[PDB]
């Protein structure tokens, strides 16, 4: 609570998960995952990995409560996939954040 920022929405990338069943599952379900991230200001982290880790957890936690509010649930596959794409977005956010303030 408090201290968070919301990144701008990002184009959803084509993501390949390495097997036939997951690629299809992802293509069909990817709309259920965030297209923007919540994070704390980049200055508050010792490096990229630290920022990213927290950005991922914060974003997924908040997305999960809003999803629960709608009466929906994430499976273990959902969490694994969401983790991956949110990680990509957090990396992009850090790079942009790191560039600013530098």
């Amino acid at each position: 609570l408090g201290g968070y920022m919301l990144g701008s929405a990002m184009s959803r990338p084509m993501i390949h998960f390495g097997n036939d069943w997951e690629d299809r599952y992802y293509r069909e379900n990817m709309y259920r995952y965030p297209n923007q991230v919540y994070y704390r200001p980049v200055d508050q982290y010792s490096n990229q990995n630290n920022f990213v880790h927290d950005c991922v957890n914060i974003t997924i936690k908040q997305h999960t409560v809003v999803t629960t509010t709608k009466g929906e649930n994430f499976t273990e596959t959902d969490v694994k996939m969401m983790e991956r794409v949110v990680e990509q977005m957090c990396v992009t956010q850090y790079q942009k954040e790191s560039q600013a303030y530098y």
Partner: antibody
Amino acid sequence: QVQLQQSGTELVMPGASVKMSCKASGYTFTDYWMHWVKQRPGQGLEWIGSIDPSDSYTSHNEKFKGKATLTVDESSSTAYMQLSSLTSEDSAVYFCSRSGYGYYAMEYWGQGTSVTVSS
Amino acid sequence: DIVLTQSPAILSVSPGERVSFSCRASQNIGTSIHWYQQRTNESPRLIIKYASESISGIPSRFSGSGSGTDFTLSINSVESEDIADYYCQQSNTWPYTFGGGTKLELKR
């Protein structure tokens, strides 16, 4: 023409680690998954693990998780597998291979790196 | 884990003969089975993908059929260069798994 270049051989001491390279050429490196497959002398193929070069997301055969570390170097279009704490059980040929675009037949194969673990 | 069982483990064949061998999966994998040929001291080579789809530069004598759990690779007319080990592999879900292989040898 797609090529996957692997070193021919590695001689490794028991307990040591080895890092094997697989250098890709002839296509857009980040568009395709790369895979690593083990074959013991006179035995069959065993999947070790695979990597998506776009973000270095990986998947492992459960028994290689903690043993085989997969990375890529996007700038040199090279995939690496590091095997640690080698024993004679690790004496084998290791192939890298590349699948299709959103399809997972292993379309291209390296020539394999033959690893011998011995003191 | 999806277990892939190949049979027979060894097949003796006469040049020119039509041969087939089978790969059976412990669970339904749709058409997510691929076949590889591996000659002595060589890398495997993709021969048929997704049960039945042909591969560029592979002889038309190779074909595959099946969907679900029971798959077959057939060679219309066996040639000496086809003497090799043959493996199936599934890519439907993790972990990838391989059959134990079928070895082709010449009957004499």
